[PDB]
Amino acid sequence: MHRTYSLRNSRAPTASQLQNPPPPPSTTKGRFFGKGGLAYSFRRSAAGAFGPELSRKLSQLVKIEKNVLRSMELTANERRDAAKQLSIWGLENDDDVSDITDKLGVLIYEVSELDDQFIDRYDQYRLTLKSIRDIEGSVQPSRDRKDKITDKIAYLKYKDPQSPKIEVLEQELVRAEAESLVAEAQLSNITRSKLRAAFNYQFDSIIEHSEKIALIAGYGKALLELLDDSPVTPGETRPAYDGYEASKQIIIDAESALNEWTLDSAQVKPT
Amino acid sequence: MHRTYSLRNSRAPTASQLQNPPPPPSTTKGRFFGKGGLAYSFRRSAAGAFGPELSRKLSQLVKIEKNVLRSMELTANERRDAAKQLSIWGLENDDDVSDITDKLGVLIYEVSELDDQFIDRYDQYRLTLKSIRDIEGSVQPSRDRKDKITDKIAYLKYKDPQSPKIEVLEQELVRAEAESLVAEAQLSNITRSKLRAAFNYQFDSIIEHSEKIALIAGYGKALLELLDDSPVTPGETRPAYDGYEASKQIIIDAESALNEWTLDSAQVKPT
Amino acid sequence: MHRTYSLRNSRAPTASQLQNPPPPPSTTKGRFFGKGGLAYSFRRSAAGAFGPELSRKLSQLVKIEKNVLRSMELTANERRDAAKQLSIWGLENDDDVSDITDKLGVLIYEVSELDDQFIDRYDQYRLTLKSIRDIEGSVQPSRDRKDKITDKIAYLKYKDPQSPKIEVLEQELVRAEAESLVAEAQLSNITRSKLRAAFNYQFDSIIEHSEKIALIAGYGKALLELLDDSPVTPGETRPAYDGYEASKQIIIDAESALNEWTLDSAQVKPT
Ligand SMILES: O=P(O)(O)O[C@@H]1[C@H](O)[C@H](O)[C@@H](OP(=O)(O)O)[C@H](OP(=O)(O)O)[C@H]1O
Ligand SMILES: O=P(O)(O)O[C@@H]1[C@H](O)[C@H](O)[C@@H](OP(=O)(O)O)[C@H](OP(=O)(O)O)[C@H]1O
Ligand SMILES: O=P(O)(O)O[C@@H]1[C@H](O)[C@H](O)[C@@H](OP(=O)(O)O)[C@H](OP(=O)(O)O)[C@H]1O
């Protein structure tokens, strides 16, 4: 980010900013959360009311991840809805405009399925991250008791060293210590392995979806060129338009290329 | 989509589905709109209450586009918020886990700025699409009057052909016809040109953002490999971890590569 | 269909639409089901009230197929009835008009027999499709019991593993499993074979009937040319008409050609 060498949140100029000026900001910027309900805050605050202390930190993230998933679902649904209106608007216009509108409308409506698949994979990653919390919360109580029965024996030794409970308390401490050692080792093992596996799974899906979206956008941009936007003075008639044999071929080729693409066919080559 | 050769919304198997089984669906699917308020429906329904008939179809799309923008903003904000919790969770863990968590946390927090830039460019595209509606709504009333003063002269000719208003009404019809012809030609010219320009502008931003996101995801996946997830039995100590000189270099290289990338350096090559 | 590349149900222009403008829509379009009775819905809803779950899906289609057959029968009956009125109307007119009306009336009345034969063949295809449902509904109960006596043994093993019923329950499971395996294999075999045979039988009849109808229509169109429609001013007498020797020959030739046609004499050659 730009904060890593500046005291202000303003963004330093980049290659894109040098080539083209930064886009103007939004006309309206309301100073509101935009959630529209108390459900988000209630769910965020109710997680730690009764849960164990050790697993609270990770358990808090699951709720906000679910909120992210819901917001992405709403975004995808609304973007899918917009394509229908864009398509129907083209009925009362020229034939070329109507045809281009319909084809680009299905092309842009394609996005919703990719968004839904990405949402499902995000849900699986969230499920694994949730699965970590179960082992953490199971580990905590075994550690608590061993610590408590240590203060117990310390206090009882302070009160009087002639009590016969010293040896049994010490042996209970030894057994609890062995169990806690085993639990503590496996906890680190499991958290490392699960974090690595889940996070690799989550990182593959996003790049796959991004590459598919980029391919769809490129195909749409290639298709848009066929409009033949030329100025005409009043009193003239533009020639009849015939581009169905090109538009249909473009749509079929785009669908086939999107379907054929596989994981090993990734065009992006990071440096 | 899969609807183009099937009667059911189910998706036909693809290369990705053949390689890996489809992800399991979400655990909960509530049968609700999810908007959380009547504002969306109210804004959608109030657009056509008083506006001209010709521009209503295009004016209806602006509101849903604004809703899409707001939902995307909420998604970006929540995803940005999640990274902070992910980062703070790593404090109470092993040193390697904490370091990897912090670095990948900033790497995944990077996404919000790209989302905001895409939102701004989307807003500019929406502004141009709005600008089309002004010319449409200005064109409509000029066309309405010429049609009305035609039924007027027709009715007055039917009533009695000896009235002296025939010639003045006919000439007013001629003048209104000339003005309507000019307006009708320019309307088509302007709508074609503006649609092409705005839609090219909108299609470039999405592919740029997708390529940047894919690069960030690839760099993060490359960074994640350094975890060295190996199983350890209880009673052993893992060697001290030293990977700061690699993690910091990876972060710096990723930031430099993201900054250096330009429009002409697009790796994606559509067929 | 036209939905396979468009978001709207509107039909894209075709060769026929390019050659001739699309026909105007019907004058009246009532927003009603048109069934005229609750019998259709009652029969559709009563099929699954008590039947087995596996065969319900296929059993639901038989009722709607019977409804299709009844509607086709009503259509054929009404079309047959219309020819009688068309023929009787020609009595009070010119001799040539009366003769042409009678001959084309029998030619168009011919259609009803072909429709009845197609209906009978449709009924046979429906009978075979019904015959599939019997085997499906016989297969289901054999599968249900094997599954149930599995949950039974699982629960009884959970309750106490020292019961002596484990071995007898397990052997009953084994025998039911073998029977279910045999039934499951034969079910797939039978459904595939019956579907293929019935659907070939159903597809042959429709093309035969369509070819016969096309031949009849072509012969009628050829016969209609003999009317000699020419304009006449008042005060003149048209020459006496003599075309019985041509009309009777045309009717006889049409009947002979329709009778002689066989399956191997199909003129249609799909690409
Ligand atoms: O049906 P409700 O009223 O919505 O409540 C759900 C229920 O408490 C589940 O046990 C819980 O799963 P977990 O115990 O695994 O957390 C889920 O949270 P989740 O969807 O975030 O998993 C809750 O939404
Ligand atoms: O300030 P408010 O109460 O929110 O009302 C705004 C105001 O009516 C603007 O004129 C209008 O811009 P337009 O006339 O150009 O539509 C805008 O719509 P918009 O944001 O969709 O442009 C509205 O949100
Ligand atoms: O005589 P009704 O009162 O009309 O009732 C008939 C009777 O129940 C038949 O057994 C049944 O054949 P199936 O058992 O084979 O279904 C037929 O359905 P069908 O004509 O669709 O075969 C029914 O119409």
Residue numbers in the entry:
A (entry chain B), B (entry chain A), C (entry chain L): 1 to 271
From the study:
The yeast eisosome, composed of the BAR-domain proteins Pil1 and Lsp1 (hereafter, Pil1/Lsp1), scaffolds a membrane compartment that senses and responds to mechanical stress by flattening and releasing sequestered factors. MCC–eisosomes are relatively stable, and have been implicated in sensing and responding to plasma membrane stress: various stimuli, including hypo-osmotic shock, heat shock and mechanical pressure, cause eisosomes to flatten and release sequestered proteins to affect signalling or transport functions. Here we isolated near-native eisosomes as helical tubules made up of a lattice of Pil1/Lsp1 bound to plasma membrane lipids, and solved their structures by helical reconstruction.
Our final reconstructions were made with three lipid mixtures: (1) ‘minus PI(4,5)P2/plus sterol’ (‘−PI(4,5)P2/+sterol’), containing 30% cholesterol; (2) ‘plus PI(4,5)P2/minus sterol’ (‘+PI(4,5)P2/−sterol’), containing 10% PI(4,5)P2; and (3) ‘plus PI(4,5)P2/plus sterol’ (‘+PI(4,5)P2/+sterol’), containing 10% PI(4,5)P2 and 15% cholesterol. For all three lipid mixtures, the overall architecture of the Pil1 lattice is similar to the native-source samples. In the +PI(4,5)P2/−sterol samples, the AH density is improved, and the AH density resolution is best and most resembles that of the native-source eisosomes in the +PI(4,5)P2/+sterol samples, which suggests that PI(4,5)P2 is crucial for AH stabilization. One feature that was notably absent from the +PI(4,5)P2/−sterol helices was the pattern of membrane voids in the cytoplasmic leaflet that we observe in the native-source eisosome filaments. In addition, in the CG MD simulations for both the +PI(4,5)P2/−sterol and the +PI(4,5)P2/+sterol systems, PI(4,5)P2 occupancy was increased at charged residues in the lipid-binding pocket, especially residues R43, Q60, R126, K130 and R133.
